[PDB]
């Protein structure tokens, strides 16, 4: 992905170079309007091709136009990002390392201006393409991945988890390393759900321990055990085997 992204880095630069004022003064009228009064340019289906909110429970993106004033300058921010991100990748491929907020801190040594251009990027990724409105989305799709990422690294990392997994999983060699940013608080995925909702009912036909709703880390007024009778003769036959002759070893010991 990154190398394909590395390839459409300067590919998009050629679109910047060929456009002198046609799409550029289109930006200049409205990037001034970005400074004057903040409003997203599109309310139609463009938002479907757009990261609506990577980190939803925030207040607002107030000081947009981050430490980035121009487009190639903003493009250089990803040159400051991606090329450092492979520097944050390629050497790191020897050791699996689980340090979620320590990464962004060491990034702050490497990234010049941080924590605002980390969070105010994916729209300015999109919006500087929106004055273009040129690039096909599947072409641009591995890029939207990336400005999603540091945006997520910008906001919610101290409760959440960074994991780097270069080694053998369908790659016998190191031929495709990967890392992952996981969250951990499905609560914090469902806390905004609950705040947006009134009081809403889970039903799970498998959930026998009620103690795992506090794995969702939440509160519950109503949590009981549904008991139905069976005058259908016998509902089913549950049959624990445990063979003695062939000597049950059915767990993978």
């Amino acid at each position: 992905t990154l190398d394909r992204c590395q390839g459409n880095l300067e590919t998009l630069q050629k679109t910047v170079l060929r456009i002198k004022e046609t799409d550029e003064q289109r930006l200049r009228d409205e990037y001034r309007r970005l400074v004057e009064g903040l409003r997203e340019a599109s309310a139609a289906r463009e938002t479907d091709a757009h990261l609506a909110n990577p980190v939803l429970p925030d207040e607002v993106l107030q000081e947009a136009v981050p430490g980035s004033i121009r487009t190639a300058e903003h493009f250089l921010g990803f040159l400051r990002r991606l090329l450092e991100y492979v520097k944050w990748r390629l050497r790191v491929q020897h050791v699996v390392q689980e340090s979620p907020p320590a990464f962004l801190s060491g990034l702050a040594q490497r990234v010049c201006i941080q924590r605002k251009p980390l969070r105010f990027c994916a729209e300015r990724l999109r919006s500087l393409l929106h004055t273009l409105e040129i690039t096909d989305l599947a072409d641009f799709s591995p890029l939207t991945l990336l400005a999603n990422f540091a945006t997520l690294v910008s906001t919610y990392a101290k409760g959440f988890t960074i994991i780097i997994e270069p080694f053998d999983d369908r790659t016998p060699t190191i031929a495709n390393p990967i890392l992952h940013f996981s969250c951990m608080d499905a609560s914090l995925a469902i806390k905004p759900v609950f705040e947006r909702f009134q009081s809403v009912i889970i039903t799970s036909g498998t959930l026998s321990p009620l103690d795992i709703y506090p794995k969702i880390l939440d509160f519950h007024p109503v949590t009981m055990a549904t008991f139905t009778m069976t005058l259908a003769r016998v509902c089913l036959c549950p049959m624990i085997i445990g063979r003695g002759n062939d000597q049950v070893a059915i767990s993978s010991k």
């Binding site: 003695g244 002759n245 062939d246 000597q247 993978s252 010991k253």
Partner: protein
């Protein structure tokens, strides 16, 4: 010497076994085997309890009473002749130390409850609990843990005698390993298990274990955990039959530590279940053939129903 558990009891208390005169405890039976059969069922019939020798099996109107006990009453019996839907004689022997999921008084109750208070002579009484149930587990620490019993009231004599003879005393890669050790539970209740006296004292101990009035059940904990090696067993499509499927189920109805001795009729799956015990148990086993006549045979079905043969054969 030192080889004396309870021998078979009846030797005396009887004179001209035509007890047309005495039959005194049978008169207790013959009261209720005869007072009971009036309205089309017997509700009686004490298995014809005879004091000396053995007693019988009714087995002619068993219905549910003695047809369930066509088998179950036969635990200490052996049913030595077989018949048509009539009576069936047996003998009597050592077979209460096999019947150790039950108390000698518990059978004695049902020995009475079958017999419609057809009362014992007492001959069996003075031979009921001569050997209290007691096991010998061989637990993970290389010899044995000094298991007693589910029931406690036996160490009270024992520990007031035995130590004054001879004392006793990555993450996911390893998470399940303690979940197995989590399954090492209370041994059905309380266990009351003690620590090995140095592995060379049990021979000195066993001879005195039976010396009071107890008897010991040597086990074989060789399946869940085992510190030495395990051979390659492999049961190559050896479909077998429910006569011997019941057999190892009697050898293993409990956990993974109990030895076994099973009688078959002749020509039965003799070289099967031991070969089945050769592989399922995961041990390093031994056969003791009668002659070389046996030796060629028993490896051959082992060569058949086991693919364990890559010069892996020791005759």
């Amino acid at each position: 010497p030192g080889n004396d558990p309870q021998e078979a009891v009846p030797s005396a208390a009887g004179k001209q076994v035509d007890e047309s005169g005495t039959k005194v405890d049978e008169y207790g039976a013959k009261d209720y085997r005869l007072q009971m059969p009036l309205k089309d069922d017997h509700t009686s019939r004490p298995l014809w309890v005879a004091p000396d020798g053995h007693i019988f099996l009714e087995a002619f109107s068993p219905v549910y009473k003695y047809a369930q006990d066509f088998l179950v009453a036969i635990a200490e019996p052996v049913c030595r002749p077989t018949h048509v839907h009539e009576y069936k004689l047996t003998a009597y022997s050592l077979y209460a130390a096999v019947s150790v999921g039950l108390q000698t008084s518990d059978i004695t109750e049902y020995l009475r409850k079958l017999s419609k208070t057809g009362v014992p002579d007492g001959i069996m009484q003075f031979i009921k609990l001569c050997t209290v149930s007691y096991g010998k587990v061989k637990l993970v620490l290389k010899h044995n843990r000094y298991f007693v019993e589910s029931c406690h009231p036996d160490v009270i004599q024992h520990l007031l005698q035995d130590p004054v003879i001879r004392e006793c005393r990555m993450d996911l890669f390893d998470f399940y390993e303690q979940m197995d050790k989590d399954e090492e539970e209370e041994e059905e209740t309380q266990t009351v298990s003690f620590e090995v006296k140095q592995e060379m004292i049990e021979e000195l101990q066993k001879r005195c274990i039976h010396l009071e009035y107890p008897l010991l059940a040597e086990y074989d904990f060789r399946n869940d955990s085992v510190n030495p090696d395990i051979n390659i067993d492999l049961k190559p499509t050896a479909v077998l039959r429910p006569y011997q499927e019941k057999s190892l189920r009697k050898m293993f109805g409990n956990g993974r530590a109990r030895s076994g001795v099973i009688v078959l009729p002749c020509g039965a799956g003799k070289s099967l279940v031991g070969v089945t015990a050769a592989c399922t148990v995961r041990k390093r086993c031994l056969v003791l053939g009668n002659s070389a006549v046996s030796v060629e045979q028993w490896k051959a079905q082992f060569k058949m129903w086991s693919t364990i043969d890559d010069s892996q054969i020791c005759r």
